[PDB]
Amino acid sequence: EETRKIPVPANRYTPLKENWMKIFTPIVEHLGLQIRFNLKSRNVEIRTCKETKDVSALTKAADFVKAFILGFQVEDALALIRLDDLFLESFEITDVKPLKGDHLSRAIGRIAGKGGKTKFTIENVTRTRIVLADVKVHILGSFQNIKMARTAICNLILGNPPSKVYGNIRAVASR
RNA sequence: ACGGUCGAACUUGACUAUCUAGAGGAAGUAAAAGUCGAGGUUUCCGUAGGUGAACCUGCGGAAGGAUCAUUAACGG
């Protein structure tokens, strides 16, 4: 029997409560694993049973709930379940340029854009998903889509205006 | 006429300022269609370098630049 454990932070506990149903129903029904929430250590516990085939889904199942730990929505984690080549790439905003204080918050605002729209646009361009943590940035998609969204984000935090990045990312999407 | 006093004014030098005569020199403008062969587009500030400027680059600073989403406890 193979076992997976994934830690949950404190701020991810309440969303884990309100989205638990749509977390275990994709696992036990059409994927067939054993789920529980280890409440003492605050871990997510994955085990095999006698009803397991296609063992790789096991690993996929782990990444499933790991996406929900990182801040992603439930349906995007289902997209990790359904598809076979869908990856996570993560980097800090300061890992590409040293920004301190208000400049770092302004870089966050340039990634997000007013109303979120800029960030929103990049998903409709790149068929990825993006989580903006406190300093971290997480990208969910295929490898070329990850590369394209990562380049768009890095240019957004170089100092390039979000309008220019909007136009050029609409242009580069057509290849 | 000796002397004293007040003292214009004169001569010579310095320091000044003006008026005039000036060879010569360096600029601009008009006449010469004679001759030879850019680029930036986030914006800056203080420094130092890259050929003066321009722009680029190293360090430090600014916004006078477009914040979406989760987010007390519910283990000890």
Swiss-Prot record:
Keywords: Acetylation, Nucleus, RNA-binding. Expressed in liver, lung, spleen and kidney. Weakly expressed in thymus, testis and ovary. Weakly or not expressed in heart, brain, skeletal muscle, placenta, pancreas, prostate, small intestine, colon and peripheral blood leukocytes. The keyword Transcription regulation does not apply. Residues 101-153 form the KH domain. It is found in: Nucleus, Nucleolus. One of its GO terms (molecular function) is RNA binding. GO terms for biological process: ribosomal small subunit biogenesis. It comes from the Eukaryota. One of its GO terms (cellular component) is small-subunit processome. Belongs to the PNO1 family. Part of the small subunit (SSU) processome, composed of more than 70 proteins and the RNA chaperone small nucleolar RNA (snoRNA) U3. Part of the small subunit (SSU) processome, first precursor of the small eukaryotic ribosomal subunit. During the assembly of the SSU processome in the nucleolus, many ribosome biogenesis factors, an RNA chaperone and ribosomal proteins associate with the nascent pre-rRNA and work in concert to generate RNA folding, modifications, rearrangements and cleavage as well as targeted degradation of pre-ribosomal RNA by the RNA exosome. Positively regulates dimethylation of two adjacent adenosines in the loop of a conserved hairpin near the 3'-end of 18S rRNA. This is RNA-binding protein PNO1. It comes from Homo sapiens. The gene is PNO1. The chain holds residues 73 to 247 of 252 of the full protein.
